[PDB]
Design a protein around this ligand. Structure first.
Ligand code: NA
Ligand code: NA
Lengths: 102, 102, 102
């Protein structure tokens, strides 16, 4: 399985995207929380509150998920970071597999 | 070293479990913070407040830690995700190894 | 690219360090959010509030970043954890590469 990290400008866009991903069963679930972001943007160090999102899905769904997020994401240049899970309890993995598209 | 991510329904259980893992020295440290979880429950997409926990320990203690978490976790099918640390400052790693069980 | 996780005792130090890392272009961006820490410290389980920081930068900048964080960080033995990103959307990657020093 893998985890994907992305950020949103606010909660409305975040939940909208996440729910769409769940309805299409491209992810088994997501953990969202706010954070203070500091980043470079066109010669300036911007500061802004964001909603960070941790998504859980299968490895074979990675490409389809990334492409789907690029279509739904409010940011023109969003972060879609994949981090593989080295291991996980079997019961949870089976659940994640059952919850995602066939 | 490795990081282990799991979630709890509340702070009581989260701290109780983490302090127990610390006491038995299965981990050297934990970071706890709330988040909003989204997943399928009862044929509907549910949103639920949780306490996420990031645990830090050694790779060789993974299996034992995983089993221990299963025995103590309040959820019936908790997420016990292992993510290997690619690199880290070695004075911190020395500390982590020294604080964990033989 | 890589993700670097570190923690700070307060917002003042976290913001100061992160802004310097950004002005030196050792990182393209940072996400700061609070958490409660539980860890072993010389025979006792300590409890402390912290500001966790997720840093994003290029792999080749890892060594230099770790060294700079070490020189700036308020903790004597801070956590500077590196997790490699298995994959990411190229357009986002280009932005991150462009904003970090050559
Ligand atoms: Na990895
Ligand atoms: Na909501």
């Amino acid at each position: 399985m893998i985890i994907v990290y992305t950020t949103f400008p606010d909660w409305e866009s975040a939940e909208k995207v996440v729910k769409t991903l769940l309805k299409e069963r491209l992810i088994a679930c997501a953990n969202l929380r706010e954070h203070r972001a500091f980043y470079w943007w066109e010669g300036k160090i911007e500061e802004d509150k964001e909603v960070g999102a941790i998504l859980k899905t299968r490895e074979d769904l990675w490409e389809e998920l990334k492409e789907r997020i690029k279509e739904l994401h409010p940011y023109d240049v969003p972060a879609i970071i994949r981090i593989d899970v080295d291991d996980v309890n079997e019961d949870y993995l089976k659940w994640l597999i059952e919850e995602t598209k066939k």
